[PDB]
Design a protein around this ligand. Structure first.
Ligand SMILES: [Cl-]
Lengths: 56, 101, 104
């Protein structure tokens, strides 16, 4: 089902625009099964917000 | 300095850009918690009592924090792949009560 | 700005004047929570749906504060005190020790 938890733990461990790009794809894959997920819909907004600040 | 209590907060889903997936409602009253957790009645853990006493002796240790201690669910509508409406109950969306933790 | 995490804190009961009733221990490792609950990261970490929302609202309007870094998992300790009969009484005090922090 919704796998944003797996995408998040994977990005958070990397952070401790190469990890953001990997996290943007991951969330776009599980996107279909995350259709009504609050933590996913915040992640889409979160990733988008870090693509502008810092811009890459 | 104003003490720990709930404060009103209407969340308009279009303002946070969540109107791209939430069919209904257009927003809701979430509320929020804010205020001082002072040494001298509030809902607090034993840890929050201790941290507050430690803070009164050493300022470098912060006071307990004013956070939601009682929350309630709301139901929202979204769409599935087929543009069919799906109702879902989202837990801990509304603040019923604040406390020091 | 450092993110939400646990920080060490030894509580010496004499320093808080609680040594007038707590026979044992002389103190304990309480710990404490501190740090920013930022928009991308805060989500999980560990947070309620309200904390996710408040954090998103804050990223749009700063006048609304961020979620707060508080203990989300606590554990108990046992202490010794005296009753009226000057006899030692053991008691387990709940939520004394931070095991984990989260954004609420
Ligand atoms: Cl809590």
């Amino acid at each position: 089902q919704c796998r944003i938890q797996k995408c998040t733990t994977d990005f958070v461990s990397l952070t401790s625009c190469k990890a953001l790009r990997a996290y943007a794809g991951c969330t776009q894959r599980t996107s279909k099964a995350c259709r009504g997920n609050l933590v996913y819909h915040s992640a889409v907004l979160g990733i988008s917000d870090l693509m502008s600040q810092r811009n890459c | 300095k104003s003490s720990c209590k709930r404060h009103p907060l209407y969340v308009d889903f279009s303002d946070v850009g969540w109107n791209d997936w939430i069919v209904a409602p257009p927003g809701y009253h979430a509320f929020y918690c804010h205020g001082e957790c002072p040494f001298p009645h509030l809902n607090s853990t034993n840890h929050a009592i201790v941290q507050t006493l430690v803070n009164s002796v050493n300022s470098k240790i912060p006071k307990a924090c004013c956070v939601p201690t009682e929350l309630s669910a709301i139901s929202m509508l979204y769409l599935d792949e087929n543009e069919k409406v799906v109702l879902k109950n989202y837990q801990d969306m509304v603040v019923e009560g604040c406390g020091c933790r």
